[PDB]
Amino acid sequence: GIGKFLHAAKKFXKAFVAEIMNS
Amino acid sequence: GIGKFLHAAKKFXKAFVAEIMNS
Known part of the structure; x- marks a missing residue:
């Protein structure tokens, strides 16, 4: 049930x- | 980044x- x-x-x-590290 | x-x-x-409404 929870996998998705x-x-x-x-x-x-x-x-x-990724957003915060992008700069 | 921000869009992703x-x-x-x-x-x-x-x-x-979607999952939680099954409860």
């Missing part, structure tokens, strides 16, 4: 961290 | 809501 949600949460971790 | 982050954030809104 967990994956999406991890991608939303990665994207935020 | 906003997209991922909203996909993670959608994915949560």
